Amino acid sequence: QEPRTLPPSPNWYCARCSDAVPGGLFGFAARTSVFLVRVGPGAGESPGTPPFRVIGELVGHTERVSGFTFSHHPGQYNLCATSSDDGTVKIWDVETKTVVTEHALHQHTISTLHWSPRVKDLIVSGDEKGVVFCYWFNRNDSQHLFIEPRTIFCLTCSPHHEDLVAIGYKDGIVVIIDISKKGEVIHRLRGHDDEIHSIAWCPLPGEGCYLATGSKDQTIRIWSCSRGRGVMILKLPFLKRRGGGIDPTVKERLWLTLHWPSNQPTQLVSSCFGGELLQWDLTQSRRKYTLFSASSEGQNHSRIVFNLCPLQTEDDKQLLLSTSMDRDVKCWDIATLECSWTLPSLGGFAYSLAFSSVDIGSLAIGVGDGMIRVWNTLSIKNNYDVKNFWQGVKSKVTALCWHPTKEGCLAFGTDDGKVGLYDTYSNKPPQISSTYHKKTVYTLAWGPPVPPMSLSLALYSCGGEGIVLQHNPWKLSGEAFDINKLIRDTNSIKYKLPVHTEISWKADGKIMALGNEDGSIEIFQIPNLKLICTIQQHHKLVNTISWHHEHGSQPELSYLMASGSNNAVIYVHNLKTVIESSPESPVTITEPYRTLSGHTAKITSVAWSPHHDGRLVSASYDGTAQVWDALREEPLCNFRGHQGRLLCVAWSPLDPDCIYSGADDFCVHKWLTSMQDHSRPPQG
Known part of the structure; x- marks a missing residue:
């Protein structure tokens, strides 16, 4: 009665190569494309059948898509940006599935990019040699910045301050820079000793700011801008492996990604060993968490989770999308924490x-x-x-x-x-x-x-x-x-x-x-x-x-x-x-x-x-x-x-x-x- 697409797998080991906007729409980088999935009542599925539909593809990159980010500016949720191993950063309109504009300013393999929450046309991208480009796509302006000679893994613009961007490196260095002052480091956040996988700002301002970082070192660190210092270190728990036995031959270290919900600032969602998801209670600073899918058997991911994307549907359901090395995309009901x-x-x-x-x-x-x-x-x-x-x-x-x-x-x-x-x-x-x-x-x-x-x-x-x-x-x-x-x-x-x-x-x-x-x-x-x-x-x-x-x-x-x-x-x-x-x-x-x-x-x-x-x-x-x-x-x-x-x-x-x-x-x-x-x- 309706078509279906079994898509290529979401790309692995990219700090942000999937995102979602309200209503709404989920996009994921897979091979040389971005795939688009309508989620919620707009998908037009029968009751009880999952309310989602694979609806389109962004086609044009010639190599692996390494990054994806929607605009989160009301009225322009149809705009988004990608980075690729082809050397380009493209701005797309998902209504037409066409490129609005693009640049090729990077000269080294791009790591990631992020659409500013505060500036309507600002996309910030970072590469393997540490070069950062600020791109104001809708006035044809750009600026290069160079902070430290290290491989960028992740980057997240502040939701509160238009000039502030947090960057995490392959070696565990985290910095907050001011893009209006040639990328001057405002806070150097010292603590992690391996790859930074994710940076999430606290979604309310003041204590400024709080920032959370996730790392291959198996810690989540919560930081203060006022103090420029760690205020909480959370070590990942060791939990028994759940679900069917996976292929013993496959090599898999941790990917530790984060989602800090706007609706609940005392909660923090993380990935964990084996792709389990955790909801942390930041009030009980005693390492308290709740495991997603703790009741139901066999619904958790079986391998590491790379990206988490919140999506509030037009009928007000709070959802969270996860991508994984296990090749499943899962949609989580935040109210129940079930898949x-x-x-x-x-x-x-x-x-x-x-x-x-x-x-x-x-x-x-x-x-x-x-x-x-x-x-x-x-x-x-x-x-x-x-x-x-x-x-x-x-x-x-x-x-x-x-x-x-x-x-x-x-x-x-x-x-x-x-x-x-x-x-x-x-x-x-x-x-x-x-x-x-x-x-x-x-x-x-x-x-x-x-x-x-x-x-x-x-x-x-x-x-x-x-x-x-x-x-x-x-x-x-x-x-x-x-x-x-x-x-x-x-x-x-x-x-x-x-x-x-x-x-x-x-x-x-x-x-x-x-x-x-x-x-x-x-x-x-x-x-x-x-x-x-x-x-x-x-x-x-x-x-x-x-x-x-x-x-x-x-x-x-x-x-x-x-x-x-x-x-x-x-x-x-x-x-x-x-x-x-x-x-x-x-x-x-x-x-x-x-x-x-x-x-x-x-x-x-x-x-x-x-x-x-x-x-x-x-x-x-x-x-x-x-x-x-x-x-x-x-x-x-x-x-x-x-x-x-x-x-x-x-x-x-x-x-x-x-x-x-x-x-x-x-x-x-x-x-x-x-x-x-x-x-x-x-x-x-």
């Missing part, structure tokens, strides 16, 4: 999509960050109900395939040639094949066993080196067979066999198609993989083959086979005549049944609609997905929402209008054919 909702995210390319035939709507996603996702797409009260599977994965998941009948049984393949089998209904690590492919596993498919296998379906895996292995899913650590031996024996072949790049079983389990590096597709019949047909149509490596389903309006449709290669043109072949004649020597086909032209770059994936006769969706390196009436050679609908090159596509199981696609932009989009306003791919 209202979670938005998961992706840290690598979306290589593979597979819907389970057993549990309808269960969508497995193979991702380049070494975790399998299982998205329960049909979850009633959660648009983003996603579970992570990390055990035994440990490399980019380039292929996936659910077992056709056994609940929870998920085969996976990796960029290092590994083949594994998960039981997603259990907590157990996956079984791993003892035999590896030399190169990336591009395809997994289930089908009947063939000799010499004894063992009921076999698992078939295709690697980039060109070998298809047959595995026993009950004895994965046993022998796996290269099917070329059977193919050579059965067909009396003398020359070297083709380099296989794709495998696809017909839905009846009687016919195996192999696509090859030279563009050919070969059609083999059970029981012994007797070759009955060679299709010579593509002239470049075959990336994808898909056979039409068996529940269409006519029986003839299940003989239709779509295919894509490194060329842009897609073919459909109709294999009824050759399959039904079961020829004693193989036939060669050199003319397509249908031809689907329009894409302008390689085809990575094609899929037939389970809801239609002869309706195909294709994913392309041209950055689009195309829906076709294949039987009429008619392009219907072109989706252009990805920024990257598409790697996978899958029709939704219940909605004829809804398709999922994954790309090398680290996104999975759920989109509606009815909402797209182009019919064919771009010509250029």
Whole structure:
């Protein structure tokens, strides 16, 4: 009914790369973009369903976005600023998602930036060599300042005094400077002995001022401007680890970030070891805190939290958004300290999509960050109900395939040639094949066993080196067979066999198609993989083959086979005549049944609609997905929402209008054919 975006992960180790304004709107830096999320009644979600929607992207930076800050000036909450590893500071209007203006004054990697709470057009930025720029964007003026020769980690302009800015360094130095007096240090705040992660000013003036600082040294220090001195040191508590066991291999020190609520100046929120959040009671100066999510189990973050952003909704709910190394964005209800909702995210390319035939709507996603996702797409009260599977994965998941009948049984393949089998209904690590492919596993498919296998379906895996292995899913650590031996024996072949790049079983389990590096597709019949047909149509490596389903309006449709290669043109072949004649020597086909032209770059994936006769969706390196009436050679609908090159596509199981696609932009989009306003791919 509505689209959804599983976005790239919020960027790590940036002191301020997310922010929010009232109503309201949350923005987070992720890779080279900022993603925008409407939160509250304005999202227009049903009661009980989380009131948020991913609504847009700020596109234009060419390298990692390192900083993000909204304007907090009434009337201009639509303005914001970013910093990037591309060397620029840009001012954006989120209403148009366009750049207002920008500068390239920095000459070293920018650390962070902050929009002044007091001056409407002042953005202050700081870099790795200690250079600070004051930028008054709306009068075209700037000033450089240089305080100390040290790496800036964080910077926070005072909410009360327009000239005062606090800066924290990599070595633990904190200073308050006056930007009207060439950045003169007004207070040097001595105490921390490691990286400063966060500086929050007390939101009421006078005692002027109080400032709080958070550090890798595991302390929060509260400071006085009147005294220029520490008035309170809070050591982080040591608490037992909560939630499912995380990957023991990952290295993770503390990130200690802060939120000092305007509404409650005697409270201070911090992150803590492992991503736990704390509400500190500053009246009980006895280290009193309350743990967020102390009652509910499994809702806390499992790894360090980087940023905290308050958001007061238009219906007056006090919320707090957190970003984390665990790749979740969480929204906290401050009244209860419980997690209202979670938005998961992706840290690598979306290589593979597979819907389970057993549990309808269960969508497995193979991702380049070494975790399998299982998205329960049909979850009633959660648009983003996603579970992570990390055990035994440990490399980019380039292929996936659910077992056709056994609940929870998920085969996976990796960029290092590994083949594994998960039981997603259990907590157990996956079984791993003892035999590896030399190169990336591009395809997994289930089908009947063939000799010499004894063992009921076999698992078939295709690697980039060109070998298809047959595995026993009950004895994965046993022998796996290269099917070329059977193919050579059965067909009396003398020359070297083709380099296989794709495998696809017909839905009846009687016919195996192999696509090859030279563009050919070969059609083999059970029981012994007797070759009955060679299709010579593509002239470049075959990336994808898909056979039409068996529940269409006519029986003839299940003989239709779509295919894509490194060329842009897609073919459909109709294999009824050759399959039904079961020829004693193989036939060669050199003319397509249908031809689907329009894409302008390689085809990575094609899929037939389970809801239609002869309706195909294709994913392309041209950055689009195309829906076709294949039987009429008619392009219907072109989706252009990805920024990257598409790697996978899958029709939704219940909605004829809804398709999922994954790309090398680290996104999975759920989109509606009815909402797209182009019919064919771009010509250029």
